[PDB]
């Protein structure tokens, strides 16, 4: 009868954050010290955190101190685990577990566990953009630009010709692709009669990954 179930597992990039929750059935958490435990890919279990009745004591594994917070919600029977500054070695299956026995004592084993929720921390905490030309080709007025694609996290900055070119420039809000990476475009309108004479170069900077990219946009 007594059950627990964890929610919130997912894929996160190094340095990112993820919050897990745990619900129960057929008992109240109020009288129980609640625990988080994880099974790392090697196969061993690691105790992660504990929160006592009334939240009087919250205790953490050294490996997660300063980065994880456990909370409890007695009125609705939930326990939470916040994970920040996450690292590759946080990759594991996370279980919610209660200390319990037919009669509660000052020190009981983990008698009930949830099925677990999978947490994965991918190693790269950033990724620099790929830049592609948007090549020109309405007369008199031409439009060209750069497509800044597949980067993370925000922001990028875009200048044109190291900044000498500011008029007619539009740098668009980035969009978040289904891939979880960002993409944006920067475009400029110029005299249809400067393409091939005037050089056009978009200057992309992605501070988070110390990446700088200059790209010549030519006709065709």
């Amino acid at each position: 009868e007594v059950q627990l179930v964890e929610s919130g597992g997912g894929l996160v990039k190094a340095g990112g954050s993820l919050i897990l929750s745990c619900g129960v059935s057929n008992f109240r958490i109020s009288a129980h010290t609640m625990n988080w435990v994880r099974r790392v890919p090697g196969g061993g279990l690691e105790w992660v955190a504990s929160i006592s009745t009334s939240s009087t004591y919250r205790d953490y594994a050294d490996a997660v101190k300063g980065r994880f917070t456990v909370s409890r919600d007695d009125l609705e029977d939930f326990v939470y685990l916040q994970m920040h500054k996450m690292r590759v070695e946080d990759t594991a299956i996370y279980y919610c577990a209660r200390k319990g026995s037919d009669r509660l004592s000052d020190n009981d084993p983990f008698d009930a566990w949830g099925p677990g929720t999978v947490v994965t921390v991918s190693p790269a905490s950033t990724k620099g953009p790929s830049v592609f030309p948007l090549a020109p080709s309405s007369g008199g007025t031409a439009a060209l630009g750069c497509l800044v694609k597949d980067y993370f996290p925000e922001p990028v900055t875009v200048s044109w010709n190291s900044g000498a070119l500011t008029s007619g420039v539009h740098t668009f809000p980035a969009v978040l692709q289904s891939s979880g990476l960002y993409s944006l475009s920067s475009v400029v309108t110029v005299p249809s009669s400067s393409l091939g004479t005037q050089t056009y170069i978009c200057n992309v900077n992605h501070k988070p990954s110390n990446t700088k990219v200059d790209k010549k946009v030519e006709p065709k």
Partner: protein, 213 residues
Amino acid sequence: AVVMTQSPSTLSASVGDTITITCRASQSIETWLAWYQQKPGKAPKLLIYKASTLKTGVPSRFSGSGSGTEFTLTISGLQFDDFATYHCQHYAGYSATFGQGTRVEIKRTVAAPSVFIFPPSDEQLKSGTASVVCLLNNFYPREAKVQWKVDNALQSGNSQESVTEQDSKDSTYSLSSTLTLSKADYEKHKVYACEVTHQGLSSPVTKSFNRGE
């Protein structure tokens, strides 16, 4: 269960103008009404509560009045810093409801977009992906629609877009739409078109290209 109706949805005006935003409640809420200002990508900011009390730090050109079902936010002497979205809110002890919001923008004459379409660069194609971009440049007002067609079949679920904030100099907007396909699908088809609908046009505009050309 109190429905809050804000009007108008967009209010176009000029610096120096006095403007009025109305908020209506489906039933009496006495003076439990607040107004918030929000700029793009920023958190809402509380301006007025209890219908007419200004928060500390809120300039005196902002005022609010009303009780029961009809409320008004007034801005006397619009400044540049004031172009933003305004949200009214009924607040109760343990719940709240918001109006749809009112975007206050700079008024100018209608302007049709200039439209451009860009095929994928050969480089990107080589890596397995094909992004086609459609640019709608310097149009007004902000509402515009883009429909992608591939060999004349309307697309869906495979495009995203973003719109610039109102231009500082000509008060126009621009929009960028990206249609994304695998290299495989892209090579299955010949005609890629972006069709743009906007009040500045007498009818929808299409820009297209044939793959390979």
